[PDB]
Write a protein that binds this ligand. Sequence first.
Ligand SMILES: [Ca+2]
Ligand SMILES: [Ca+2]
Length: 249
Amino acid sequence: GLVPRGSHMPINLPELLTPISEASPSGDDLLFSNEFDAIQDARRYDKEADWGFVVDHAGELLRTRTKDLRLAVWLTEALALEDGITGLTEGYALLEGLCREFWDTFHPLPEDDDIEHRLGNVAWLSGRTAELLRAVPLTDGASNAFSTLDWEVAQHVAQSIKRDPEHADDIARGKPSIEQIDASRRVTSIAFYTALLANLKAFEFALDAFEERLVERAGDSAPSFRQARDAFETVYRLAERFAREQGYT
Ligand SMILES: [Ca+2]
Ligand SMILES: [Ca+2]
């Protein structure tokens, strides 16, 4: 055929969760490989990250050569950065799948039964997921898209300008205003809000499933998702407020 539209090919969870071989379900540990190094380099930023490269390459290794929790965590982050909330959700579905199907074999394998160290990249992902959720756009209008973090910043700016009206120019410079966000929200479609609230609920479902699988598998050594959950609740409450203001039932 001719090249498919869009930036990456469908990630294909069935294929991602198919064992590499019957003899070695998770394949070998590929940390030392050229392909793994290239992924690590692509994600490095102060150098800008190449998130598209990460999606294609981490996905390629997972589908063909190895089941690796580091790669799955990195693919989750890169999908979130490339695709938004739905990418974060697909990543969490993959993580849950790998813990369900490959607990005994996925790389890195445990050393001295240090399950905590084995899951360190997952523990990092909780904090990272809070950042990613707070960057999800709550508007798409007037040549801009504003996040939860943007709303909080705009609130903080309005407060500081009330306290310090002499420096209002410098306080407001290069930061969102409340009026600006409001105007962007006013010309954001209903369709945008349907999908945001649906996409947020599907994220919550994936987070719950992953956490549940981790209590089963890891017990006392399960990473916390408290940061991620606290963020989700802030984002969803704002999302629902903006939708209702815009006429969403
Ligand atoms: Ca790119
Ligand atoms: Ca811990």
